[PDB]
């Protein structure tokens, strides 16, 4: 198990760690989070009590270094930093534990939710969508726009997802216009799977990472990306059986975990009705369709 200590909490803020969250009061004696399961990526995220504007947060993997949070009063936000002095960092963590000023990552031993949401997500890939190579962790926030959004203004703070566009040359082979637009299997399997992502795990990892930034930060561009990647699979007549079965599992837990209060802004009615009821793969997402119908029959 690993630890993310906090120097202090000078401003009142709701802190998120994966799907968990707890309130911290202005100058409450909070010094971090402990017992973080090794082997997964994680996200620690923040919404200031005074300015709900800008949810923001950090993707990290504790295997990749010793990381702490420090509030920065000039820039006005909780900043992730890396501590390179290993002896110094064990020292800091042990004292905060001894003084028990740390919350415990509250995993229920029966619960596989986080694994089920981050199965294919890998820090090495996150750091290519979120380019800031001097840091081992990755910052994201509500307002960050995607590469495709900037194409339609600062590229240093962009989210570099794979551009998917169903009415592009990349998606449509000359001479196969009608074919490739109505059955996107070419675009899925040759262009994206074989060409760009190399395998389905990297595809699902971007898919999951897009979902998670949409939910935790209300990042609109990430939401657009998540829906696009689902629609490409669902609009492909020819998909590996194993991809269909995993996709149903991926989406089921994403639907399962989504706050009900957010369902009206994060779920695109058109895409989901198409995928679940009109697409080639309409019959191939049994789990996902059963929970969508039982939880959000209004969208459909």
């Amino acid at each position: 198990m690993n630890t993310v200590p906090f120097t202090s909490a000078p401003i009142e803020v709701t802190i998120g760690i994966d799907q968990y969250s707890f309130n911290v009061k202005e100058n409450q004696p909070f010094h971090g989070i402990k017992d973080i399961p090794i082997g997964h990526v994680h996200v620690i995220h923040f919404q200031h009590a005074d300015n709900s504007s800008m949810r923001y947060g950090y993707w990290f993997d504790c295997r990749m270094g010793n990381f702490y949070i420090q509030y920065d009063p000039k820039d006005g936000l909780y900043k992730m930093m890396e501590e390179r002095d290993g002896a110094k960092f064990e020292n800091i963590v042990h004292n905060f534990k001894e003084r028990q000023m740390m919350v415990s990552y509250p995993k229920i031993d029966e619960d596989d939710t986080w694994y089920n949401l981050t199965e294919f997500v890998q820090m090495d890939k996150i750091r290519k969508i979120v380019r800031k190579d001097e840091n081992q962790f990755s910052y994201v926030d509500s307002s960050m726009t995607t590469v495709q959004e900037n194409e339609l203004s600062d590229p240093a703070h962009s989210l570099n997802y794979t551009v998917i566009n169903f009415k592009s040359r990349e998606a449509i082979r000359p001479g196969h216009e009608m074919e490739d637009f109505l059955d996107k299997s070419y675009y899925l399997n040759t262009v994206m799977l074989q060409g760009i992502f190399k395998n389905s795990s990297n595809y699902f990892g971007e898919l999951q990472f897009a979902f998670l930034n949409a939910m935790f930060f209300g990042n609109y561009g990430s939401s657009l990306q998540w829906h696009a990647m689902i629609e490409l699979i669902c609009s492909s007549a020819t998909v590996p059986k194993h991809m269909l079965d995993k996709l149903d599992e991926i989406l089921y837990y994403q639907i399962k975990t989504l706050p009900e209060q957010y369902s009206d802004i994060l779920l695109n009615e058109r895409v989901w009705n198409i995928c679940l009821y009109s697409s080639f793969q309409k019959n191939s997402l049994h789990n996902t369709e059963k929970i969508m119908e039982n939880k959000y029959p209004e969208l459909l």
């Binding site: 009415k167 592009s168 040359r169 449509i172 000359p174 216009e177 009608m178 637009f181």
Partner: protein, 237 residues
């Protein structure tokens, strides 16, 4: 992507534009089979592609053989239309390629966009007005060349005959839409209006009779009367 009458003038400016109508591309007769079921038999169709400024009509004849062994023909027709239109653009010299293409049905926006990916600066937009272009088959010479075709064929017409020597494109297109609207609402009576006076003939290189300006006014009035009537007949008013 449909605008309002506001700019009926954008039509007749100097930006090259074409109207694409696909109504008559896929055409069938419906009939009973010996076993008492229903079957369709396809007949020749056409794409109606018109420059509203010049009156040039690029009438792409669609032969019944294009459907042979194809499924989902009504959906295929929209893609066949988009393919033919794209081929037409590619066959024109650059300086004659349209800056924008106006589809008269919203179902053509995506087939055409996809076929025109190579022409990003050609704007594709649909109407939300009501244009009578489906009545182009009521024009005898046009109907005749479609039905006689034995193979795919492109036939070029000027749908305004020589009117532009005497009137503006704006007026020329208002006359054409009034003639087509009339033909669509009551073909028999519309055709009666146009030919009742045998002293006014149709030149071999024209589609419509050689009316004087005076006679066009009278004709246009009779077509308006016709449409207003049929509106009465229909709605009881």
């Amino acid at each position: 992507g449909a605008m309002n009458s506001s700019n009926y003038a954008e039509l007749f400016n100097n930006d090259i534009k074409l109207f694409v109508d696909d109504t008559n591309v896929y055409r069938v007769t419906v009939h009973k089979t010996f076993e008492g079921n229903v079957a369709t038999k396809a007949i020749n169709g056409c794409i109606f592609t018109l420059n509203p400024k010049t009156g040039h009509l690029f009438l792409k004849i669609i032969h019944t053989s294009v459907w042979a062994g194809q499924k989902r023909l009504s959906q295929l027709a929209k893609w066949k239309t988009a393919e033919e239109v794209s081929a037409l653009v590619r066959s024109l010299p650059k300086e004659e390629q349209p800056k924008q293409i106006i589809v008269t049905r919203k179902a053509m926006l995506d087939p055409l966009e996809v076929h025109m990916l190579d022409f990003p600066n050609i704007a594709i937009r649909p109407t939300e007005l009501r244009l009578p272009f489906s009545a182009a088959m009521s024009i005898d010479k046009l109907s005749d060349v479609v039905m006689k075709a034995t193979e795919p064929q492109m036939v070029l017409f000027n749908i305004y005959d020589d009117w532009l020597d005497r009137i503006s494109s704006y007026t020329a297109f208002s006359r054409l839409t009034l003639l087509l609207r009339a033909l669509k609402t009551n073909e028999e009576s519309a055709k009666m209006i146009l030919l009742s006076d045998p002293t006014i003939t149709i030149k071999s290189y024209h589609l419509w009779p050689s009316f004087t300006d005076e006679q066009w006014i009278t004709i246009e009035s009779q077509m308006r009367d016709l449409i207003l009537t049929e509106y009465g007949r229909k709605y009881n008013v």
